[PDB]
Amino acid sequence: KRMRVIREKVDATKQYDINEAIALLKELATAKFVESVDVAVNLGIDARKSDQNVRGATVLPHGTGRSVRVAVFTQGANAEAAKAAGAELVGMEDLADQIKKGEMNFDVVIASPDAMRVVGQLGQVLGPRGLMPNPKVGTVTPNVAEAVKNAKAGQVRYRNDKNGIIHTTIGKVDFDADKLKENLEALLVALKKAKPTQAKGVYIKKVSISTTMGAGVAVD
Amino acid sequence: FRAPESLPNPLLKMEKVSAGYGDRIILDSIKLNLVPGSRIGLLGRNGAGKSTLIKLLAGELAPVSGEIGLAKGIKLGYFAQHQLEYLRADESPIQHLARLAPQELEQKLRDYLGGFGFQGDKVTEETRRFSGGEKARLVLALIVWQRPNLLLLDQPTNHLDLDMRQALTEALIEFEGALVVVSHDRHLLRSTTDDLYLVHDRKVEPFDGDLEDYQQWLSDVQKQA
Amino acid sequence: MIVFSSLQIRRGVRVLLDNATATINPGQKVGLVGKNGCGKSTLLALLKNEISADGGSYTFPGSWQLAWVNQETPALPQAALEYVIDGDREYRQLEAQLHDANERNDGHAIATIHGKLDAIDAWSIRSRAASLLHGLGFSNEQLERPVSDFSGGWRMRLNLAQALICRSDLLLLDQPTNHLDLDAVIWLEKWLKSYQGTLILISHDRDFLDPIVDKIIHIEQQSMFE
Amino acid sequence: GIREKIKLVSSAGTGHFYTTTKNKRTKPEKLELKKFDPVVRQHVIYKEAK
RNA sequence: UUGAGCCUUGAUGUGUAGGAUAGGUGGGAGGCUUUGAAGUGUGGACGCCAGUCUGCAUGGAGCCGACCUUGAAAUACCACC
Ligand SMILES: Nc1ncnc2c1ncn2[C@@H]1O[C@H](COP(=O)(O)OP(=O)(O)OP(=O)(O)O)[C@@H](O)[C@H]1O
Ligand SMILES: Nc1ncnc2c1ncn2[C@@H]1O[C@H](COP(=O)(O)OP(=O)(O)OP(=O)(O)O)[C@@H](O)[C@H]1O
Ligand code: NA
Ligand code: NA
C-alpha cells in the first residue's frame, strides 16, 4: 500500500518548492512511526581519487531526531574534563582493549592525542563499522571538554560514497517546516564551506528530502 | 645435438616410487621405462605432478619409498620448468660453461657460445641483465654441450622465439637418445613425442587416443561439478 | 592517448631503439611483437617509470592507474593471500606509514592515515582477495599456503590475480599464459575481451593473440612499426 | 662522428649547465663531475643530463 | 532492420567459519498480509547447479527485526544510487 498509493500520488517529472515539498511530505505520514526526515544530496566529486575526500560536521538547533551517548577516551589525566562532560560512555586505556571486545561503542568517539589505544584496538571493530576518530573531520582535538560539549548538541556528520553522495539527518517530521528550512540551509552552508579544492563543476547536482519510513522526493 | 654413447639398455630401475614431497604424497604409480629410443610426452592438468616426475627421474627429489635407480652411464639433460633461475646468476656464460668443462678448452671455447646467440662481449656478464629469452637459450646451450643421451624438458619453449622453436623442434626430431618432454603446444608433441602418457590423479598411466581425445577428455571432467 | 615520439632507448652500451614513434588511442587493446632480446620488457619498464627514456618523452596521461604483470616470479615465503594483497598498492604504503606513526607516536598522523585507509575499502581487502582467488580455482586451504611451492601453473594464477585486485586503467600483461592450461586460458581471454581499460600485451602465441588484440607494435630493426 | 652532445647541469638548484660531448657507445655511465657555479660562486657537483 | 546517448520501471549480483547466492553508504529496530497470509498443485528465467525466482487460482489471513558465526551485518521496509 505504501508503495502503491503515494507512488501514484507523487510525480517525478517536476521539482517542488523547498517548503511545499516538505509540507506534502509531512502530509504523507505513511508509517505508524515518528518518521524522522533525512536529506540526500548528490555532490559532484570524483570518488575514485583520494584527494577529494569530504568530511565535515554541522549543528541543527531544532531537531536531531535522537540522543547519542558520546564516549570520550582520554589517556592519563585526560579524563579531568571527561568526568564533567557527562558523556554516556566511559573512557580508559585499560577499559579500551576489553571494552572493544565486550561492548560495541557509543554514538561518537573521544580523541586522546596521547592515548593511541583506540586506533590500536579498534581496527575492524572501531573503523569498519564507521565510528573511528577523524583528525581531519574534527574528532581528535586537544579540547576534550569542548568536543564532548559539541557532540551532545547534535553534531551531524557525513561522508562520501562510491558515488560522491551525502545523506544524513535533519530532524523529525514533527519539527516545523521553518525549522527544516533553517536546518537545510545550515547544512548546505557547512557543505559549501567544506567543498574541496580540486572540485570542478557544480557541487550540488541534486538535493532531496526523504521520509525514512515512507517516500522521499527531490526538494530543490 | 651431438652423438653420445647411448650404451645403458636398462635406463633406470623403477619400483614402488611413492613420490610425496614430504608433507603429502604426489605420485605412487609409475609407467613403462624409457627403453632407449622411446619418446614420451606427459599430458595432464596443472598441479598433477608432471614436474615432480621429471625431477624424480632427474635425481633431485629423493622418493620417500626409495630406490628410484639410474643406469651407470647416463648423461642427463634437464630443463626445469619455472626454475629458469636455477643457474647461478652472478657468473657470466663463459665462466659458467668453463666450470662445466674445467680443464682444457681455451679462450676459443667462446667460439662455441658465439654460434648460440651470445656473439659479442655478452659472454662477460650475466644477471637478471639477460632477458628471459636468452636466459632460456643459455640453459639449452649448456645442455647441448656435454652430449646428453637422456633429455628431460619441462616446457622448454616458454620464453623461446618462433625461430628458436623451429630450431629446437628440428633438432629434437633428429635427436637419438631417450626424450621426455612436457608441454601444451600441439606442434611439439605432434612431431616429436610418440607415447603420450597421462598423469591423472596420483598415478601415471599409458592413456589412450591422441591430443584430440585428450582435449575433450579434459572438458568431460567438468561434469563432476 | 599514449604517445612515443623519437624514443631512443639505449641499454648500457647497446641501443634498443634508434628513433621510433607510435601512438595508442585510449580503449584499444594492443599487442607487442618482436624477437628474443629485443626490448619489449624494456618498453614495459619504461612505462612502469623505472628506466630512463634517454630523450623520448613517452608522456601518457598521468591520471591513470597501472596494473602490471612481470616476467619472472621468484620463490617467496609469503602466503598466497599476502602475495595477492601486495598487488593492491597504496595500501602497503599506507600501512608502512601507519607503522612508522605507531612506533613514533604521531597522534595527528594516526588519525590521518586511518582516515585515508577508511577512504578505500581497506578492512574488506582480505575478503575481496579471497573472492577473486576463488574464481581462479583454489579452495580455502591454499590461502595460507606459501607461494614457494604452488606448482608452476598455479603460481602464474597467483601473480595474474595479483593484477586484478586494484581496478586499474592501464593493464600491462607480459606473457600471461606461460604455464596456464586451456582451462584458464579461456577464462583469461573471456575476461580480457570484456576488459574496459587500455591493455598492452606481450605474447608469442598467435592463437591466443588473435581474438583479443586490435593492433600490433612490431619492434623489428631498432624501430616500431604499427 | 660518434660522439654525442650532453649537458651536465648543476645540483645547486639553479639553471646553469656546461655543455660537452660524450661517447655513448663505449662508456656506459652518467658523468658526475664537480665544477664552479658562478650563480652561487661555489664549487658544486655537476651531473650529466638531457 | 540496426547502433549511441538521456528519463523511468523491474530484475542483477556469497564466500571462506554461516539458518542463508550478508553491493555500498545507515534511517531505523518493526511495518509488511489484508484492493484479503504462509504452504500445497504449476510454468518461466537465472543458475558461483547451494539456491533465487515470479503469471494464475486454490489455500484463504500471516512470517520476517530480536539473539545467531563475522571484514561487515541484514531484501523489516525505504531513501540516493
Ligand atoms: N636489467 C638489465 N640491465 C642491463 N641490460 C639489460 C637488462 N635487461 C635487459 N637488458 C638488455 O636488453 C636486452 C633486451 O632485454 P629485454 O628484457 O627488454 O628483452 P625482451 O624484448 O623483453 O625479450 P624477451 O622476449 O626475451 O623477454 C637484453 O638482451 C640485454 O642486452
Ligand atoms: N616444493 C614443493 N613443496 C611442496 N609441494 C610442492 C612443491 N612443488 C610442488 N608441490 C605440489 O605438488 C603438486 C604438483 O606440483 P608440480 O610442480 O609437479 O605440478 P605439475 O603437475 O608438474 O604442473 P605445472 O605445469 O604447474 O608444473 C602440487 O599440488 C604442488 O602444490
Ligand atoms: Na612442471
Ligand atoms: Na622480457
Side-chain angles (χ1 to χ4, degrees), chain A residues 1-65 71 76-77 79 81-82 84-87 91 96 102 111 113 115 120 123 127-128 130 133 135 138 142 145 147 151 153-154 156-220, chain B, chain C, chain D:
Chain A
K1 296 182 181 183
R2 159 163 47 222
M3 36 212 291
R4 277 100 162 268
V5 187
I6 43 161
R7 197 34 51 76
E8 287 290 340
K9 157 186 167 167
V10 78
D11 284 330
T13 187
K14 186 64 164 37
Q15 301 267 26
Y16 312 127
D17 184 19
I18 58 170
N19 295 319
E20 84 195 36
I22 77 170
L24 200 135
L25 264 278
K26 298 171 68 50
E27 170 71 42
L28 297 197
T30 323
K32 309 267 201 279
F33 222 101
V34 80
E35 293 167 349
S36 305
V37 285
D38 272 27
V39 298
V41 50
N42 182 17
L43 307 189
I45 35 177
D46 290 325
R48 313 300 300 113
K49 284 179 162 183
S50 93
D51 210 34
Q52 304 155 349
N53 208 16
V54 158
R55 263 197 167 275
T58 201
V59 287
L60 311 173
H62 296 294
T64 279
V156 162
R157 279 260 192 224
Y158 41 74
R159 201 194 54 247
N160 326 316
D161 220 5
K162 87 199 306 279
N163 280 317
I165 62 82
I166 289 273
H167 44 252
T168 183
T169 173
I170 188 182
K172 304 186 205 70
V173 60
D174 163 87
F175 294 92
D176 260 26
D178 36 45
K179 310 175 168 189
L180 294 199
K181 191 201 312 190
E182 53 206 338
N183 292 318
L184 261 173
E185 285 239 13
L187 175 55
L188 256 63
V189 169
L191 219 66
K192 85 151 92 159
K193 186 257 201 74
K195 191 182 71 65
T197 80
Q198 333 292 134
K200 322 283 203 296
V202 52
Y203 94 113
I204 47 156
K205 333 193 55 65
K206 281 277 285 302
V207 202
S208 307
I209 167 66
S210 80
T211 36
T212 40
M213 321 315 148
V217 294
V219 55
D220 214 12
Chain B
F1 289 102
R2 285 281 89 75
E5 46 171 359
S6 92
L7 288 180
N9 204 147
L11 276 205
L12 60 103
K13 192 192 225 51
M14 203 56 108
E15 50 97 41
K16 333 291 178 62
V17 317
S18 161
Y21 253 120
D23 262 359
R24 218 165 144 173
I25 60 139
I26 298 294
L27 311 146
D28 50 22
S29 300
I30 219 66
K31 40 72 172 176
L32 157 56
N33 259 324
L34 318 185
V35 55
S38 94
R39 285 124 79 78
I40 51 193
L42 269 187
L43 303 189
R45 257 172 311 106
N46 255 335
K50 306 181 291 319
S51 205
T52 62
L53 180 49
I54 292 304
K55 248 180 298 167
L56 181 50
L57 294 156
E60 320 273 21
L61 182 88
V64 310
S65 87
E67 223 284 306
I68 220 71
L70 204 160
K72 292 143 45 180
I74 295 207
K75 290 180 262 218
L76 202 78
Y78 177 45
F79 205 128
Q81 160 183 240
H82 92 302
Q83 203 84 287
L84 217 42
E85 56 276 66
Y86 94 102
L87 83 180
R88 272 72 171 194
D90 43 11
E91 292 182 2
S92 35
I94 188 46
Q95 63 135 338
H96 207 127
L97 168 67
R99 84 172 165 89
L100 193 138
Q103 86 278 36
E104 196 51 357
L105 285 320
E106 323 277 29
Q107 216 174 227
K108 303 321 284 137
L109 157 80
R110 84 160 69 189
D111 293 353
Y112 162 82
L113 256 192
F116 264 83
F118 315 91
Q119 45 95 39
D121 205 78
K122 201 167 179 86
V123 280
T124 52
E125 187 39 271
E126 203 264 15
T127 323
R128 163 69 185 155
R129 266 54 213 183
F130 275 30
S131 77
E134 47 245 52
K135 261 203 286 212
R137 221 195 311 134
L138 179 54
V139 187
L140 202 180
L142 285 205
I143 273 149
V144 169
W145 159 270
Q146 71 263 20
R147 251 162 306 253
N149 56 357
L150 168 57
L151 253 202
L152 296 153
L153 311 180
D154 218 336
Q155 265 147 47
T157 88
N158 261 339
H159 320 252
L160 273 202
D161 206 33
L162 276 92
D163 170 42
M164 280 331 286
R165 281 177 270 283
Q166 166 61 77
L168 173 76
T169 295
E170 163 265 349
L172 258 54
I173 293 173
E174 160 264 308
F175 184 54
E176 307 290 303
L179 177 125
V180 197
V181 54
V182 52
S183 170
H184 321 271
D185 40 13
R186 320 241 310 275
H187 197 345
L188 249 192
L189 306 193
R190 192 95 38 73
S191 61
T192 43
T193 57
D194 308 341
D195 302 17
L196 280 310
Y197 284 99
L198 185 61
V199 196
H200 224 306
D201 51 286
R202 307 221 275 96
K203 53 181 158 136
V204 46
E205 98 169 43
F207 184 65
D208 192 300
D210 258 350
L211 309 151
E212 57 184 9
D213 307 277
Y214 170 48
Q215 261 149 0
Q216 278 139 74
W217 186 99
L218 291 158
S219 60
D220 309 328
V221 192
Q222 303 291 78
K223 305 309 116 189
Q224 215 71 83
Chain C
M1 259 175 75
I2 79 174
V3 186
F4 314 125
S5 175
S6 313
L7 206 38
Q8 178 76 301
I9 301 177
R10 94 179 307 111
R11 210 73 191 244
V13 161
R14 153 158 324 280
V15 48
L16 266 43
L17 306 173
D18 204 3
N19 66 309
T21 75
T23 37
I24 285 136
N25 315 330
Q28 148 190 73
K29 297 149 183 127
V30 192
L32 243 179
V33 165
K35 207 162 277 304
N36 279 44
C38 169
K40 296 153 301 198
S41 278
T42 279
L43 261 301
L44 290 204
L46 182 105
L47 295 169
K48 280 198 229 151
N49 280 24
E50 34 204 42
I51 81 176
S52 315
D54 202 9
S57 61
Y58 74 93
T59 82
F60 74 95
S63 166
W64 263 357
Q65 275 255 27
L66 274 53
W68 67 70
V69 162
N70 35 283
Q71 207 184 357
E72 321 292 335
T73 304
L76 297 177
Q78 311 169 266
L81 271 283
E82 271 55 50
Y83 197 70
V84 169
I85 293 184
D86 196 289
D88 195 66
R89 315 154 223 290
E90 100 175 67
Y91 158 66
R92 294 261 161 244
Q93 286 78 77
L94 272 198
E95 219 169 2
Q97 322 161 329
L98 177 132
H99 203 14
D100 249 347
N102 280 332
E103 266 150 341
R104 203 167 28 122
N105 222 61
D106 210 29
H108 307 76
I110 274 187
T112 302
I113 295 170
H114 270 271
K116 309 260 156 167
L117 273 177
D118 290 313
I120 71 199
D121 199 4
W123 325 112
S124 158
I125 186 52
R126 283 183 96 87
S127 156
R128 268 186 291 142
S131 198
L132 162 81
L133 267 176
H134 170 49
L136 281 82
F138 299 92
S139 74
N140 50 65
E141 310 101 273
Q142 312 115 332
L143 306 195
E144 58 272 22
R145 274 180 197 173
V147 310
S148 186
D149 54 79
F150 255 119
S151 90
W154 286 98
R155 184 185 328 216
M156 208 33 208
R157 281 139 161 119
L158 256 300
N159 84 327
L160 192 128
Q162 198 194 267
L164 322 168
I165 205 54
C166 51
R167 221 276 322 170
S168 58
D169 323 286
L170 178 68
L171 192 52
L172 298 175
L173 285 159
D174 191 316
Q175 300 221 261
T177 75
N178 243 351
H179 306 109
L180 257 47
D181 314 278
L182 203 77
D183 200 74
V185 165
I186 288 320
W187 165 89
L188 187 56
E189 84 164 59
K190 227 70 76 191
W191 158 278
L192 277 205
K193 212 167 201 338
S194 94
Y195 189 53
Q196 287 302 305
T198 288
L199 165 142
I200 296 170
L201 208 167
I202 304 182
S203 162
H204 306 151
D205 269 291
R206 159 185 85 74
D207 314 329
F208 174 70
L209 212 53
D210 261 14
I212 88 165
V213 83
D214 311 351
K215 103 154 168 188
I216 273 176
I217 310 272
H218 183 16
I219 308 191
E220 204 174 349
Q221 313 142 19
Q222 303 125 43
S223 181
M224 321 185 318
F225 308 97
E226 42 262 10
Chain D
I2 70 172
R3 266 171 110 71
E4 254 318 303
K5 196 119 54 172
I6 56 139
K7 163 209 313 210
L8 52 156
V9 56
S10 161
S11 279
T14 82
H16 175 276
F17 49 85
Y18 288 80
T19 174
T20 187
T21 64
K22 162 190 209 60
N23 192 186
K24 259 165 165 148
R25 64 188 99 191
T26 305
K27 289 252 177 309
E29 51 197 318
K30 293 231 316 179
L31 252 186
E32 202 51 26
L33 270 203
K34 109 170 308 182
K35 220 168 315 201
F36 198 54
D37 190 353
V39 170
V40 307
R41 266 156 83 219
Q42 295 280 328
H43 262 61
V44 289
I45 279 184
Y46 276 78
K47 47 160 71 51
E48 156 197 11
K50 194 62 168 221

